[PDB]
């Protein structure tokens, strides 16, 4: 459609807000990011395409710490993704201020999703060209993983993928029995799936970013250490052959 | 936002304001409203566009509005826009009275509204008020006065003038028959009905007259009743027929 696709304050005759759909295409063109809910936590893996070897490792970090107990993994226009992390950081900080404890992930997902939805209603602003996955572990609430898109929809996921290989990554996740497996195991299988769905012919070389949150980390979102990442990268290369 | 902007407050290439001109075309369709100065008074006579069998007649007028004790006005255009402007005129009249404890002079009250109308042409991005007003009044400085204004925020003082449907035809007819310095309110009332007979398509339900006069140190504003109008219609019909024979 043409004419009706310039403002988020304008529906088309079909009943579609094309500005929101065009923001979702910037995510579909962006590189693949994934995350799976384990038995004892949640793991994140990201295909970070290196534009130049001139850049340092741990630059353009598409994995972020929203809170001490929550991890954000993003795909889309990265500037928008960082500002969404700043919104989620403050929103989580506001909960601790108001109620004196760590924000629940479903609530954190809902409150940041309504932030994302607000930008899909007006000519005065545009939607966020970014989908992201929020993940967390706790004592009582346990392992939880939610994904949000440019429109502002929030759903909970056992497994989830966003980016270039959205559909291709999901059929590889369906094979894994994530509900029985642990975080220690899942890091190998998350690293495997990125190496599969990575297009070596089309795209340049990449760095695998890995983070996690679980009973291993005492419900704290840390990076996966270099011991375990390089074990999982080795597993990805040799099991590809 | 920028695509949806009408841009009411801009000069067109010719060097002129489109919404101001287009608002004056709205007035050219609306009812024939005129005013005539005299030595012993001032009058306003208007075409009554609210004309049906089932209309109620609550108010003492329909197009005529009192403003101050010594002042009044009639309108031509969108009547809703007139209700805003007349309300604001009344507010200005009392704002002056609160401040100085005298009635507002007629030119000052007209300039005050016309400064506001001009603002809607220059800034705010808003459409102008689609109303021309004819004002009547008395003050201690210039006495019996008649003023015209229009959507641009421009005003002028007139001896006699008209606005509405057949505006130009009525003014040229007034330019023939008006005698400066020599006209009384009785002679002016005859000329008012003469001009409205030309313009309109003449029963007294379709006409609405009022007369501002000064009797015994206090201003007297009164609408004419339908007995007064109908006898003045028959006096025109007889005076028109008496000339036709001779």
């Amino acid at each position: 459609g043409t004419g009706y696709d310039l403002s988020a304050s304008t529906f088309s005759p079909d009943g579609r807000v094309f500005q929101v759909e065009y923001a979702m295409k910037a995510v579909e063109n962006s590189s693949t990011a994934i995350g799976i809910r384990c038995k004892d936590g949640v793991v994140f893996g990201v295909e970070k395409l290196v534009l130049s070897k001139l850049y340092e490792e741990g630059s353009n970090k598409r994995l972020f710490n929203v809170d001490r107990h929550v991890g954000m993994a993003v795909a889309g226009l990265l500037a928008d993704a960082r500002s969404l992390a700043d919104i989620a950081r403050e929103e989580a900080s506001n909960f601790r201020s108001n109620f004196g404890y760590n924000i629940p992930l479903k609530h954190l997902a809902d409150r940041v999703a309504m932030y994302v939805h607000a930008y899909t209603l007006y000519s005065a602003v545009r939607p966020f060209g970014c989908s992201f996955m929020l993940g967390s572990y706790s004592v009582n609430d346990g392992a939880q993983l939610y994904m949000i898109d440019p429109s502002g929809v929030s759903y909970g996921y056992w497994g989830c993928a966003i980016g270039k290989a959205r559909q291709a990554a999901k059929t590889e996740i369906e094979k894994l029995q994530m509900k029985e497996m642990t975080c220690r195991d899942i890091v190998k299988e998350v690293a495997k799936i990125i190496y599969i769905v990575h297009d070596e012919v089309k795209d340049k070389a990449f760095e695998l970013e890995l983070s996690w949150v679980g009973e291993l980390t005492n419900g704290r979102h840390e990076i996966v250490p270099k011991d375990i990442r390089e074990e999982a990268e080795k597993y990805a290369k040799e099991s590809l052959k | 936002s920028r695509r949806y902007d009408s841009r009411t407050t801009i000069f067109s290439p010719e060097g002129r304001l489109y919404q101001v001109e287009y608002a004056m075309e709205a007035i050219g369709h609306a009812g024939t409203c005129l005013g005539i100065l005299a030595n012993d008074g001032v009058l306003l006579a208007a075409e009554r566009r609210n004309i049906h069998k089932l209309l109620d007649e609550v108010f003492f007028s329909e197009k005529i509005y009192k403003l101050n004790e010594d002042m009044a006005c009639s309108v031509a255009g969108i009547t809703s826009d007139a209700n805003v402007l007349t309300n604001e005129l009344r507010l200005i009249a009392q704002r002056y009275l609160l401040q100085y404890q005298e009635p507002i002079p007629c030119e000052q009250l007209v300039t005050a509204l016309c400064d506001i109308k001009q603002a809607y042409t220059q800034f705010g991005g808003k459409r102008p008020f689609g109303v021309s007003l004819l004002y009547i009044g008395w003050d201690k400085h210039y006495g019996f006065q008649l003023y015209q204004s229009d959507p641009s925020g421009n005003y002028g003082g007139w001896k006699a003038t008209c606005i509405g449907n057949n505006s130009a035809a009525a003014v040229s007819m007034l330019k023939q028959d008006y005698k400066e310095g020599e006209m009384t309110l009785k002679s002016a009332l005859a000329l008012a009905i003469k001009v409205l007979n030309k313009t309109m398509d003449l029963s007294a339900e379709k006409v609405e007259i009022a007369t501002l006069t000064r009797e015994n140190g206090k201003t007297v504003i009164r609408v004419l009743k339908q007995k007064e109008v109908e006898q003045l219609i028959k006096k025109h019909e007889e005076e028109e027929a008496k000339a036709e024979r001779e």
Binding site: - | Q19, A23, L54, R127, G130
Partner: protein
């Protein structure tokens, strides 16, 4: 927001959104109002699309204060804004003056609000003409107010679908000192001209205003008037 008028003058010199709003009124479910000597009537078509609709729930004929009432043709949601606002304007008069608001003065205040949306920034006007019944100085009052913000005091009139037929029907058949018994009966006969179906207590709505203020008529009260038609 948007700080510019959406309603503007065309080369002809007409405020096009107001005439387009009048088309929304003109294509609305019809409404009638009649001023008797001893009272005022307001009646309208309440024919919803199915028997599934709960008829008792939402009302077209609504009170503003205990002595003034209201009805519309055209847009329903727009109408509800004007009802809430008119209700406030009535209390804002009563608080200040300690007197029931004159019907003329309520119409003038709501007219000013209706005018506001034909000029102010980033808003269309209302797609509604209101009919406002009342009782002030021991006598009845009926007023129209249409999307422009212009108002007309009527003895009787019609709105919506077949308003031209309702107005001419009324013109010849209205007498200037009718009884309120007869006027209620006339209002239902004006609606039966424009109706498509068998009329009932449910599918039309009537309110009245007299010595003891305004009220909405019950279904059984309407059913008595429908028995002799």
């Amino acid at each position: 927001g948007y700080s510019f008028s959406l309603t503007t003058f065309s080369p002809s010199g007409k405020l096009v959104q107001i005439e387009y709003a009048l088309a929304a009124v003109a294509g609305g479910a019809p409404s009638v109002g009649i001023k008797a000597a001893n009272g005022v009537v307001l009646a309208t078509e309440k024919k919803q699309k199915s028997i599934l609709y709960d008829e008792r729930s939402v009302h077209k004929v609504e009170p503003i204060t205990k002595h003034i009432g209201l009805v519309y043709s055209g847009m329903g949601p727009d109408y509800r804004v004007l009802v809430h606002r008119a209700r406030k304007l009535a209390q804002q008069y009563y608080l200040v003056y300690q007197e029931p608001i004159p019907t003329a003065q309520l119409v003038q205040r709501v007219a000013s609000v209706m005018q506001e949306y034909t000029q102010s920034g980033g808003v269309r006007p209302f797609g509604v003409s209101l009919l406002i019944c009342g009782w002030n100085e021991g006598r009845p009052y009926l007023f129209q107010s249409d999307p422009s913000g212009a108002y007309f005091a009527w003895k009787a009139t019609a709105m919506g679908k077949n308003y031209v037929n309702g107005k001419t029907f009324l013109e010849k058949r209205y007498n200037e000192d009718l009884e309120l018994e007869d006027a209620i009966h006339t209002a239902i006969l004006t609606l039966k001209e424009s109706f498509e179906g068998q009329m009932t207590e449910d599918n039309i709505e009537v309110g009245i205003c007299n010595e003891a203020g305004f009220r909405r008529l019950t279904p059984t009260e309407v059913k008595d008037y429908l028995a002799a038609i």
